[PDB]
Write a protein that binds this DNA or RNA. Structure first.
Lengths: 124, 242, 129, 110, 143, 173, 93
RNA sequence: AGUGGUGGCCACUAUUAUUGGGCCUAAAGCGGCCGUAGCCGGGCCCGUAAGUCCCUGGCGAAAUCCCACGGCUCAACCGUGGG
RNA sequence: GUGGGGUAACGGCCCACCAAGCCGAAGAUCGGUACGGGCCGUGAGAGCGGGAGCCCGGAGAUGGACACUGAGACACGGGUCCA
């Protein structure tokens, strides 16, 4: 259970005891930690209200876009730099805003692979 | 605590717009979602059983509605929890009896009988303008219905404008705009069940709606929310309005 | 140290008339004091009242007719609307419509009776009976 | 200069933040207030204070009550202590941040 | 001097002073801290069911002279033991050893010892569920 | 919510003056309990409270309520048709008491005594507009007194019930 | 003696509602069958299509209210009207 | 067809004192002075209009409470209407 | 605060870094006490006291902890574990 509930402290540091339990709607979910692979692996998850969320766990291809606007489906070699956190880049973990090394060169990812299920980036 | 939606309503907590004996019984029929809002409409069963008195018991009202004798704006409705809102026309052709639901000065709904010639016109206020793919404009009315028009004629419509709506076969008839001098009937507020003419349009910023100043037939000036003002005629009301 | 000219003035008037003098001089003269002095004289409580240009703060001269029983300034400026006015008449006056009260409404200092028909609230300032 | 519909001249220079009502993404809706800046130590954050009176039934006198509010301070205005500031409701920014500064009426020197 | 503060912006002190001095009251202190409801052997109960242990009498306060009969009751509810005055003429004979009895406060000043007899707090009403007043009148019979 | 008593007890059970002032009326009007007299006293007091409240009120609702109050007081037969708001303060308990059903039916000469009239009423023998009431405490309006007759189904609607001639002779006597 | 005030026709049900008053000064309350045979005479109704629910006599009142229904066909009661007032009237065993 | 005992709450009480209490001798001014916050502050003019006041739009559910009428004998109770 | 994650959804809710902020004498923190309200009792009222009985909102299935299925649950007459 991952609880996205109330902070258990007041702004003034005051301790708060929970007057009620955790409702089902307020729990979270596992981070994707999407890795680079030779194939594309995805999970379709039933969500709140019966909707569906697609989650990319293994990635092998990306949509590199040029400044003009054309997109190209080109592969992913490795990850260059992850400004969000330095451990991800070592582990070939891809997240929004990360810099990825591909055949074209350097690309910045402008996607949410943990929610979108796809990898889209802009050439740099 | 509660875990999902509910199907019950105590008679005590019923909306104040209803003419119902609150302490007669414990329970009342829950209105199902429909065209109008909760504050604006009533279950049809209370119309049949109480306002018309045709059926003493709810069971026989349900039976008659199942027979489909009653026409709701030209459409049979056998459900016994349907919400009937403002300016809906209830027609029973077997009696030939046709009524329009209108707010009382007290703010409760009452049936104004009307002739047959008025039974196929419904005025609908244009609640919102949107447009869908294929560049097809859509208008959402105050009563929760939707109509489609093309992009070219879009300038002939605006939000809050009234449209005389031939409900028997879904034909637009006329468009009454929202301009100074138009004859206006109030739907809510302290000035409910009033009829006058528009004088001034008070635009308000910071999320606050517009206030329209309405002068009565005798010249009394009052103010009312723009949403509450329903245009009913260019200079004189096009419908029989108490 | 001095804090409020008006209450001092009203106490001066009352104390001076308990012994029953004729001419009373109030030292700290201000405009509001004059606007006050208008009101009851308009009801004939006092005789002539006038202002003397001293040179520091002015003096107020009043002749006493021996009409007032008690004249005091209610300090804490209670704001009162119209329809509840009676709730204060029971607090400062000895009988039904006996005496008056002074209110500083939007239109100036003036008697309470004249405010009922003018339909104005305001803050109570003083009273006399 | 993109309109917010509040009677005030925008700040002169524009900012690249995604949180400036004039030059960002977030929008203005809800209540508005006027207050005074008393603390601005943390990054792009302000603690405005507003003074008012409260009436009590039993004693019919007044009781001063204070309200401290945490509004976001975008760089285009750069609020400081001693300044009178207009504040507006916004979308939830952070745990405590739910407001934004939209105008500076008088600088500290005034 | 003048009773203070009388200011229009003095609500805080005018309230604080009154709240503070309301503690100088004794009855309010007795209620809000509920120490009547912590010292009580009867735990706020106008009645209680007890067992008698031994009959004792006490000397009336001077100048009142006589012998006031009563018993000692341990309380089945919690276990505290208190004196229990017995009213009626020759009623001590009616109340026996080891009796289920019903006892209730004696209604003196502030609930204190009534009248001319000191110390006591309670009087007996029912003995073995039978009202003692009638048994003083002899209308009923103890089981 | 719990339904409250409609009548007010005296503030002291043992004041001599009030006790005797009660007793004189009890013997005169012969009510079962002081509860009845207290109820009628409260009934008066309601009118008094409404009057003194309204007399100091300025407004449209005040005037409207004032007219309604005057109208229903007159309808009861308490006041003259030209009464005003000032005379209600001079009303007395006996003004209510004379309007009691038992009192009125006796003043029509329909009984030789208060208690006899009460017996006839409680035994369902007196009709108003052709309707039977078994409550001597009832207060009559000014538009119904003429309908106070003997109940048709009663044996005393028959003009030769043996008590009837004695009743009518007492009326004569 | 029985005298009518209300005679109202419900054509959605095709049924007649009769609100009537019985004068019974000094005699016991009339029964269902007596008034049933009484109204049908001067109203000229089919007895089997005609049903009565209630006859309320007030306290200390010689005039009692009563309500009856008058249908047209033998299936209308079996469909719409509840099953009690056939049994209370003997129309169903 | 109630009536008594007892326990809890309000009034009695201006024995909690805003309305509305005292502090020389009855409990009650600290030995004295200085001083921060707070509170209370001189007269006149100009501006502002936050408080303050009048008018007006939206809003505080139902239930309870006040009154007229009507229904159940009346009442309580229920509805219609005004607050 | 920067940049990210998960959420139906914004939010330190969560993560990596960056910085020292946040609250408190007008009462923080800690402890006692306690479901909030429409309302109810008393009182001439200012007011004091109470919140069980009817309606709305909040929360809980012996104490605790957890999933699945469902639009809607951590689910009184569905499920799993410790005592």
């Amino acid at each position: 259970a991952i609880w996205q509930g109330r902070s258990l402290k007041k702004p003034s540091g005051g301790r708060i005891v929970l007057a009620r339990k955790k409702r089902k709607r307020e729990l979270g979910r596992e981070p994707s930690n999407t890795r680079v692979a030779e194939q594309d692996k995805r999970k379709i998850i039933r969500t709140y209200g019966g909707n569906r969320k697609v989650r990319l766990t293994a990635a092998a291809y990306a949509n590199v876009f040029d400044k003009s606007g054309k997109g190209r489906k080109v592969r992913i070699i490795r990850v260059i730099e992850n400004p969000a956190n330095r451990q991800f880049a070592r582990r070939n973990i891809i997240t929004k805003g990360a810099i990825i090394e591909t055949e074209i060169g350097k690309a910045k990812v402008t996607s949410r692979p943990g929610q979108d299920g796809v990898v889209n980036a802009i050439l740099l | 605590a509660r875990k999902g939606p509910k199907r019950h309503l105590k008679r005590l907590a019923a909306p104040t717009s209803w003419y119902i004996e609150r302490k007669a019984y414990k329970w009342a029929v829950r209105p199902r979602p429909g065209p109008h809002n909760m504050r604006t409409s009533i279950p049809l069963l209370y119309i049949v059983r109480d306002y018309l008195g045709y059926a003493k018991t709810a069971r026989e009202a349900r039976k008659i509605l199942n027979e489909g004798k009653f026409l709701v704006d030209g459409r049979v409705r056998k459900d016994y929890k349907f919400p009937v809102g403002i300016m809906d026309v209830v027609s029973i052709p077997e009696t030939g009896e046709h009524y329009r639901v209108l707010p009382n000065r007290i703010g409760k709904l009452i049936l104004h009988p009307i002739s047959e010639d008025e039974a196929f016109i419904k005025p609908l206020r244009i609640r919102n303008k949107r447009m869908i793919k294929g560049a097809r404009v859509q208008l959402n009315f105050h009563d929760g219905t939707n109509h489609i028009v093309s992009i070219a004629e879009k300038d002939n419509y605006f939000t809050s404008y009234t449209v005389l709506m031939k409900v028997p076969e879904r034909e637009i008839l006329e468009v009454l705009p929202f301009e100074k001098g138009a004859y206006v009937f109030v739907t809510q507020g302290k000035n409910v069940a009033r009829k006058g003419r528009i004088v001034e349009i008070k635009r308000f910023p910071m999320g606050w709606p517009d206030v329209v100043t309405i002068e009565d037939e005798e010249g009394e000036l009052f103010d009312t929310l723009k949403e509450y003002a329903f245009v009913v005629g260019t200079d004189k009301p096009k419908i029989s309005l108490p | 140290t001095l804090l409020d000219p008006l209450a001092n003035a009203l106490s001066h008037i009352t104390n001076s008339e308990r012994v029953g003098k004729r001419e009373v001089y109030i030292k700290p003269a201000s405009k509001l004091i004059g606007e006050v002095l208008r009101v009851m004289q308009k009801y004939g409580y006092i005789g002539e009242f006038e202002f003397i240009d001293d040179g520091r703060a002015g003096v107020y001269r009043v002749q006493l007719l021996g009409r007032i029983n008690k004249a005091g300034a209610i300090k804490p400026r209670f704001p009162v609307k119209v329809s509840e006015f009676e709730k204060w008449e029971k607090r400062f006056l000895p009988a039904f419509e006996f005496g008056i009260l002074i209110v500083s409404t939007s239109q100036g200092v003036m008697s309470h009776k004249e405010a009922i028909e003018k339909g104005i609230g305001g803050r109570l300032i003083a009273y006399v009976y | 200069m993109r309109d917010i519909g509040l009677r005030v001249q925008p700040p002169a220079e524009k900012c690249d933040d995604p949180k400036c009502p004039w030059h960002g993404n977030l929008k203005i809706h809800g209540r508005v207030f006027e207050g005074i800046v008393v603390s601005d130590k943390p990054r792009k954050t302000v603690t405005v204070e507003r003074q008012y009176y409260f009436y009590l039934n039993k004693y019919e006198r007044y009781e001063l009550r204070r309200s401290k509010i945490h509004a976001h301070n975008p760089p285009c205005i750069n609020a400081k202590v001693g300044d009178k500031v207009l504040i507006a409701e916004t979308r939830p920014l952070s745990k405590t941040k739910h407001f934004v500064v939209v105008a500076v009426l008088e600088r500290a020197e005034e | 001097g003048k009773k203070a503060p009388n200011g229009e912006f003095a609500g805080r002190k005018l309230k604080l002073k009154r709240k503070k001095f309301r503690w100088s009251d004794i009855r309010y202190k007795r209620r809000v801290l509920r120490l009547k409801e912590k010292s009580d052997p009867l735990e706020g109960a106008p009645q209680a069911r007890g067992i008698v242990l031994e009959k004792i009498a006490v000397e009336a306060k001077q100048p009142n002279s006589g012998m006031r009969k009563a018993v000692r009751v341990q309380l089945i509810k919690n276990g505290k033991v208190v004196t229990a005055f017995c009213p009626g003429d020759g009623a001590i004979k009616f109340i026996d050893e080891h009796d289920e009895v019903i006892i209730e406060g004696i209604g003196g000043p502030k609930g204190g010892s009534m009248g001319d007899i000191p110390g006591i707090r309670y009087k007996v009403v029912k003995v073995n569920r039978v009202s003692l007043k009638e048994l003083v009148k002899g209308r009923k019979e103890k089981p | 919510k719990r339904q409250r008593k409609k009548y007010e007890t005296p503030p002291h059970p043992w004041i001599k003056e009030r006790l005797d002032r009660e007793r004189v009326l009890m013997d005169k009007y012969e009510l079962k309990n002081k509860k009845e007299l207290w109820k009628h006293e409260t009934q008066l007091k309601n009118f008094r409270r409404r009057a003194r409240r309204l007399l100091a009120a300025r407004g449209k609702q005040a005037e409207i309520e004032r007219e309604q109050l005057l109208a229903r007081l007159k309808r009861l037969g308490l006041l003259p048709e030209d009464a005003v708001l000032d005379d209600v303060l001079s009303l007395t308990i006996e003004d209510i008491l004379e309007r009691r059903l038992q009192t009125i039916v006796y003043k029509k000469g329909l009984a030789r005594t208060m208690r006899q009239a009460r017996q006839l009423i409680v035994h369902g023998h007196i009709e108003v507009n052709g309707q039977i009431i078994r409550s001597p405490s009832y207060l009559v309006l000014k538009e119904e007194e003429d309908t106070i007759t003997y109940a048709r189904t009663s044996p005393f609607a028959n003009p030769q019930h043996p008590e009837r001639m004695m009743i009518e002779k007492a009326k004569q006597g | 003696e029985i005298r009518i005030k209300e005679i109202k026709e419900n054509k959605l049900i095709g049924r007649k509602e009769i609100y009537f008053e019985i004068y019974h000064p000094g005699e016991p309350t009339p029964s269902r069958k007596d008034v049933k045979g009484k109204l049908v005479a001067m109203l000229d109704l089919n007895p089997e299509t005609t049903v009565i629910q209630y006859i309320r006599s007030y306290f200390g009142s010689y005039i009692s209210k009563g309500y009856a229904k008058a249908y047209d066909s033998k299936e209308r009661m079996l469909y719409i009207e509840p099953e009690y007032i056939l049994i209370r009237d003997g129309l169903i065993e």
